[PDB]
Design a protein around this ligand. Sequence first.
Ligand code: SF4
Ligand code: SF4
Ligand code: FES
Lengths: 83, 208, 109, 112, 673, 44, 18
Amino acid sequence: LGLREIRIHLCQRSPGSQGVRDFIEKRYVELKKANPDLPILIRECSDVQPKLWARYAFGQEKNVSLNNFSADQVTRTLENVLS
Amino acid sequence: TRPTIRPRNDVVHKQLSAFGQYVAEILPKYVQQVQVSCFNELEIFIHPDGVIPVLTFLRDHTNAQFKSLADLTAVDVPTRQNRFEIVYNLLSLRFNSRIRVKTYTDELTPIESSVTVYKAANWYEREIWDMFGVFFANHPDLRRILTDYGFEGHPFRKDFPLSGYVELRYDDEVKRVVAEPVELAQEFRKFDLNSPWEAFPAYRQPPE
Amino acid sequence: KLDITTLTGVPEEHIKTRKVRIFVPARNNMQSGVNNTKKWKMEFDTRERWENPLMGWSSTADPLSNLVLTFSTKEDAVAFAEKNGWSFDVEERKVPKPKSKSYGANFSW
Amino acid sequence: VKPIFSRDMNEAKRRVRELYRAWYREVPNTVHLFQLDISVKQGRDKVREMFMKNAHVTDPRVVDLLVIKGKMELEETINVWKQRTHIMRFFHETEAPRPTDFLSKFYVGHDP
Amino acid sequence: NLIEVFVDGQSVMVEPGTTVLQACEKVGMQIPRFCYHERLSVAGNCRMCLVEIEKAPKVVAACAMPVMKGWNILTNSEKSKKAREGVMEFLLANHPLDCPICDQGGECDLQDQSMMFGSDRSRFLEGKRAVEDKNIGPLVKTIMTRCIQCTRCIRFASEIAGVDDLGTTGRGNDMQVGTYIEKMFMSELSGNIIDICPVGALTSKPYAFTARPWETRKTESIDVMDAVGSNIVVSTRTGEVMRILPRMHEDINEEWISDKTRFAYDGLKRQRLTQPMIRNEKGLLTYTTWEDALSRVAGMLQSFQGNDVAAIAGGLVDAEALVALKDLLNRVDSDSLCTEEVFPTAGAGTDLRSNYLLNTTIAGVEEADVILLVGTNPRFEAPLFNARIRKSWLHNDLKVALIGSPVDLTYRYDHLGDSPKILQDIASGNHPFSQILKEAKKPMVVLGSSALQRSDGTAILAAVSNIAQNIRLSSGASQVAALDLGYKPGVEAIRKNPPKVLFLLGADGGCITRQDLPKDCFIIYQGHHGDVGAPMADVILPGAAYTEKSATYVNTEGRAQQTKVAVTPPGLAREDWKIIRALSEIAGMTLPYDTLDQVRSRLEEVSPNLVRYDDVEGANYFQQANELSKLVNQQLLADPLVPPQLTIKDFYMTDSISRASQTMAKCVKAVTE
Amino acid sequence: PVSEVGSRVISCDGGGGALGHPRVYINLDKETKTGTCGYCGLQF
Amino acid sequence: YSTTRKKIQEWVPPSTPY
Ligand code: SF4
Ligand code: SF4
Ligand code: FES
């Protein structure tokens, strides 16, 4: 179970964010109910490109950049998220 | 309103005013403005390229037989598109009166030397060169004075610490005086005397 | 990007490992005055200052702690430090919001 | 916009090379006349280093201005202006060593 | 719709009404003043503000008459000037020749007004009145005699501190702003008057005589005694802090400051870490080289890579230290992100950020039409906020309610009952109060941090949120920073005993229990006082106070502004994080950053919302979604809910620095005796 | 050293006419009083 | 010589064990 944490960044106004903004109002609670385990930090950071981050015990980190992706795609990399 | 305050003559203010107008019309390819400081000191401006031609005529008669530079001051100011601000006093003898032309300059643009026009300005070119960055073109020999040899950074740059970045001290192991960073004791205590409440309604810039 | 670092004799240390801190100074609050508040200035960061073993004086190492410079506009200040190739920390002018006042509102009821 | 000297880079680089020729050839005379006991090589190397100090400047006018400030020094050593102290000054030889390693600095002082 | 009005010459489209003073303030020309003060109240005394109407023969007080109808006003008119000289001679007719000794001497407004306007010759030629002192408390040094009856301070007390103990007394000369009766005036905003007092009639005893205004450098930064994050101007006479003053800022302190913070610095001077101290074989603390110590523990903590090791922050520390320690904890395989407050984390308020946020700006508090206090009494944790709500309390007739305590806030407010009772009842609209909460515009739900512990903190949070859900349906330090970066649980409840705990400051949580110590007496202690944590901890690391560090702190609103450097660490001590950036480098797991700015770039990754120092705003998780996020838990509750502070004396001592304070000790002795 | 008598307010200067501390008015009688720099208390 | 006593007066670890 290598991942310890996961995080996500999202500017509130870039259009490329909304395909991820839409991901949060609905998919999220489903995720936490599906993810009692490791932390799933969300941020309102105004970085123009929303991002994704993932801790290990190693300290190495997933760094998934995204651009205007559909929320289902967010879900896709999210299911690509594993152990 | 008599015993303390200076009387300030109207007359001189008149003559300088009209004369400022006089030169203003004679050669207006470059006289940006001919402001008269109210205590009887005329002072026209100059486009930096225009230094030689103006001063040249300034020796040349019409009335402007203002021979002898009194000085070549170099006021600094960190703001402005070009910081350094050069100034030339001048004196006419037969009509015993003084004027004061002045320009402006980039940190990097080489304005020409004015040694030929006022004659006794050779020393000044060297001065301002070693007290500032500014360069004078067509000057026979800029070089350091009023400094050490190396030393490098110009003083009077309005920034640049008065304590400088260096110090000499004699060192027996090498048996020689040597440079070394300031290590200054006591530190220049720096009072901030400047105070609230503007004293001068007669000036004071618009809030903008 | 008119860098002039070579022209100034300033040692690399102090164009590098320290930062300017542009701001318009706050009113001394003991004062009710406003004059000194206005106009940008360009304070540097503090460094070490110990004590003289003798007499207890505040002996000091840094070349340029006391330096400070007024300005008329912030953009001019930032551009200024840029000409010097300086690291900077620009801060907002923070003019107080205008406020309503009424001697009679004290006597509502 | 008025240029100081050379237009565009490279035209100014040749100037600086000329300057290196002048300095380099002059150096043994400097060590001789000044009775400097620096290794005759060392001055040369140090010259090359000082030439590396601004080996990234890229502005138009600034470099020629750099050779203006570069002339005056050989101008001084050739006229025996400056002295043994003044010319030995460049080697910073009396200074206590100051490693740039983070931890090394870290033990020593409060640092920036 | 806003009237044209002429400042002396130029036209100005001034706001409707508004005082002549405010008009010239708008053009920026500044009228001489004393008794008037914005963020206080207008008054007709001290007629130093007289100005001449363009036509009407007699001058009128500048802060009195609102401008209207194309008025012109010659501030510089000669009759105005004769008026001002006229008044100034009167003020100086009795103020005692005390300039050299009066501690206000460097910048007393009365001096500068005397210079800019007052006639220089004296022409009073009789006898000044002078009066006996009125002792008032541990702090303020009243002298009177230098008093000029700008009532000001009373208008401070009745209208902000809310106490009306002090007041004017008597008539004509002999009238005095001193309170009748010997009784001491203690209040939490008692300190700010030392700022507000026009002259030297009231000046801080602890700072008295120690320094002069033209001397001290005036660094800008922010307070740390509170997470409220108010802006300040620290003032130092060369290599040493002298006195603190508030720095005005609209979102927070606005020209005010607390009081515990105002005198907090004094503790720095006393007991403090200086050199690393290993336990000796005898178990005594003993002074040591920094190098051997740090290398010692650097090797010591490798054996336990994975879990075991357990860093413990204090309540004051320290953004850069938390990122640095964070990589300390991820480069090692497992870790203990343990704060101190027993803050509940299941249902995760952290991941959405907004639940631990104070959603409306404190600047927005005056806009709220109802406040629902929960357990904690605001004055003793967010004093500025208490000032804010009181400010609106005068500005607005808006309701507030205690849920619940017997605490003595200055203003009228509804008192409720017990936790699960009144909370879940109003949540289910059983309470009549739920109704008024329904009709209320932009309702505000104030839940204190202190309330969350209290055995079942999560239950209270669930109950209060429900109230938030209902309103929406009807319609019409060392804390917030960690949750900005997810260091939850934060509570020490993970244990599971983990060997080799790593205090950042055990002065706080070391009072708790040393239960892991028999299992492992060893405790690295990275504090800056010998208080509490040091004696029961092997390997001591000296560390910097907040004045030195550039490290940012987060406003409870989520604003994340930073303190600036001031006076450098006292001794061998370094800035806190930098010790860690050393430590990782020793371990071989050297961290990517090294400069402060590289690691500001690491805030620029791991957050990157902290690197927006004044920028509170965010996309927001929406309260309903957070409610759904927490909906899956829900658990049993209980009635009691008592705030930690209650009494002010309890407020005087919190973090170890405050107990290192001489003057705070003098205050706790003062109120108790 | 011993306090001067008063009833009540009275001058102090430190005794040096344009040589002492600048003139002030202590204001006590039966009470101990003052002062500037001059210790000239008015306890009486 | 130096005048005006001391500065920080830093605290030290107790003699007693644990
Ligand atoms: S403070 Fe009071 S006493 Fe001291 S100078 Fe200003 S006015 Fe005179
Ligand atoms: S108390 Fe402060 S404000 Fe009230 S009168 Fe005395 S000095 Fe003026
Ligand atoms: S403020 Fe206008 S009367 Fe004092």
